[PDB]
Design an enzyme around this catalytic site. Structure first.
Site, PDB file in Angstrom:
ATOM      1  N   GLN A   1      35.548  20.178  73.223  1.00  0.00           N
ATOM      2  CA  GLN A   1      34.377  20.964  72.884  1.00  0.00           C
ATOM      3  C   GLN A   1      33.326  20.729  73.960  1.00  0.00           C
ATOM      4  OE1 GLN A   1      32.873  21.130  68.797  1.00  0.00           O
ATOM      5  NE2 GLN A   1      30.793  20.843  69.604  1.00  0.00           N
TER       6      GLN A   1
ATOM      7  N   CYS B   1      32.195  24.505  67.446  1.00  0.00           N
ATOM      8  CA  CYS B   1      33.195  23.812  66.641  1.00  0.00           C
ATOM      9  C   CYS B   1      33.996  24.694  65.688  1.00  0.00           C
ATOM     10  CB  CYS B   1      32.607  22.637  65.842  1.00  0.00           C
ATOM     11  SG  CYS B   1      31.330  23.058  64.620  1.00  0.00           S
TER      12      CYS B   1
ATOM     13  N   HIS C   1      29.929  19.534  61.058  1.00  0.00           N
ATOM     14  CA  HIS C   1      30.937  19.805  62.067  1.00  0.00           C
ATOM     15  C   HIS C   1      32.240  20.199  61.398  1.00  0.00           C
ATOM     16  CE1 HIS C   1      33.154  19.305  65.747  1.00  0.00           C
ATOM     17  NE2 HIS C   1      33.570  18.069  65.533  1.00  0.00           N
TER      18      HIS C   1
ATOM     19  N   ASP D   1      39.556  17.273  66.806  1.00  0.00           N
ATOM     20  CA  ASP D   1      38.111  17.346  66.916  1.00  0.00           C
ATOM     21  C   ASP D   1      37.787  17.380  68.410  1.00  0.00           C
ATOM     22  OD1 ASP D   1      35.431  16.784  67.110  1.00  0.00           O
ATOM     23  OD2 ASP D   1      35.465  15.236  65.543  1.00  0.00           O
TER      24      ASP D   1
HETATM   25  N1  LIG Z   1      28.746  23.388  63.362  1.00  0.00           N
HETATM   26  C1  LIG Z   1      28.620  23.414  64.813  1.00  0.00           C
HETATM   27  C2  LIG Z   1      29.774  22.644  65.464  1.00  0.00           C
HETATM   28  C3  LIG Z   1      29.574  21.122  65.342  1.00  0.00           C
HETATM   29  C4  LIG Z   1      28.498  20.536  66.247  1.00  0.00           C
HETATM   30  O1  LIG Z   1      27.339  21.016  66.227  1.00  0.00           O
HETATM   31  O2  LIG Z   1      28.834  19.446  67.087  1.00  0.00           O
HETATM   32  C5  LIG Z   1      27.635  18.725  67.482  1.00  0.00           C
END
Ligand SMILES: *NC[C@H](*)CC(=O)OC
Ligand SMILES: [Mg+2]
Ligand SMILES: [Mg+2]
Ligand SMILES: [Mg+2]
Lengths: 75, 229
Positions: free
Chosen positions: B88, B94, B168, B183
């Site tokens: 990510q 996410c 998340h 993740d």
């Molecule tokens: N819900 C957004 C994705 C998760 C995130 O913000 O990671 C920091």
């Protein structure tokens, strides 16, 4: 009468309601007890999604029934 | 590339529409998970090939994540080469990454439209590293646009792009006999033990339970199951 609302985590929220209460009203009661905005709430009874405009009676929700609460959160 | 996206709502209607727009046929559909006991899990259609869990990335959670990372780097774990993992590198992406992980790791079970943009993304990134995949997503307009459109759907209104997000999404899938948590914020998939095609939901829920009992004061969890339809 009382009804129980269970969250995914397994927490049981006990509410004092009336058969005439609308789903919208139930959500407001959940907000008062848990601070969860109604918009984030999706209520379920015996596998059926409940809509704001109908009442507990409409869904034949009687005393001591358990509803399930799904949270519409943003990730 | 420093982009920021909007957080997606944990809602089967939203996620199923997102997949449709990316060209996946609807014989796999996400459904809500109402509870963790046998009776409620029995309501989830089978088979289940993925579970997306929305959970709070609180201070307590980060302490555990830090410990977990060091434990795995120092003690090792097994991760089969078959696993498709992507990092990510886009704030708030996410949800998209969770959906990509769910479909990528079950690609052979999916039915795609001929010019499916998700199918194209997966075919072109099949041999890229987790890091290269993140860079590729940064340049893949089709998914950026669909994510944005889907972010405005749901029961709740989409927040400002700069607002703090402390929730998340992660994907739990079964690959070659093990349960993997995917993740993109982590340096690698997390192997949570054995599982099978038939017990993925139950086994994934046991992992979700762990997340919950680590953060006893939080109720902000949501699990959706990608089930056969
Ligand atoms: N819900 C957004 C994705 C998760 C995130 O913000 O990671 C920091
Ligand atoms: Mg389609
Ligand atoms: Mg069925
Ligand atoms: Mg395939």
């Amino acid at each position: 009468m009382q009804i129980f609302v269970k969250t995914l985590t397994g927490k049981t929220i006990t509410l004092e309601v009336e058969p005439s209460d609308t789903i919208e009203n139930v959500k407001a009661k959940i907000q008062d007890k848990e601070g969860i905005p109604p918009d984030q709430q999706r209520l379920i009874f015996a596998g059926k999604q409940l809509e704001d405009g109908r009442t507990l009676s409409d869904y034949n929700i009687q005393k001591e029934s358990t509803l399930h609460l799904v949270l519409r959160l943003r990730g | 590339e420093g982009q920021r996206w909007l957080p997606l709502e944990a809602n089967p209607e939203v996620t199923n529409q997102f997949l449709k727009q990316l060209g996946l046929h609807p014989n796999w559909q996400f459904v809500d998970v109402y509870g963790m006991d046998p009776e409620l899990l029995s309501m989830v259609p089978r088979p289940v090939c993925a579970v997306l869990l929305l959970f709070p990335i609180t201070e307590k959670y980060e302490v555990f994540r830090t410990e977990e990372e060091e434990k795995i780097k120092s003690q090792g774990q097994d991760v089969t080469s078959s696993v498709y993992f992507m990092k990510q590198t886009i704030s708030n992406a996410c949800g998209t990454i969770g959906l990509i992980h769910a479909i990528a790791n079950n690609k052979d079970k999916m039915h795609f439209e001929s010019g499916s943009t998700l199918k194209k993304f997966l075919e072109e990134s099949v041999s890229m590293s987790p890091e290269e995949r993140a860079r590729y997503l940064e340049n893949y307009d089709a998914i950026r646009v669909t994510h944005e459109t889907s972010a405005h759907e749901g029961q709740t209104e989409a927040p400002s792009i700069d607002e703090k997000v402390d929730l998340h999404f992660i994907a739990l899938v079964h690959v070659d006999g093990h349960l993997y948590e995917l993740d993109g914020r982590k340096p690698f998939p997390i192997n949570h033990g054995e599982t099978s095609d038939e017990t993925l939901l139950e086994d994934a829920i046991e992992v979700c339970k762990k997340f919950m009992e680590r953060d006893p004061d939080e109720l902000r969890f949501n699990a959706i199951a990608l089930s056969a339809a």
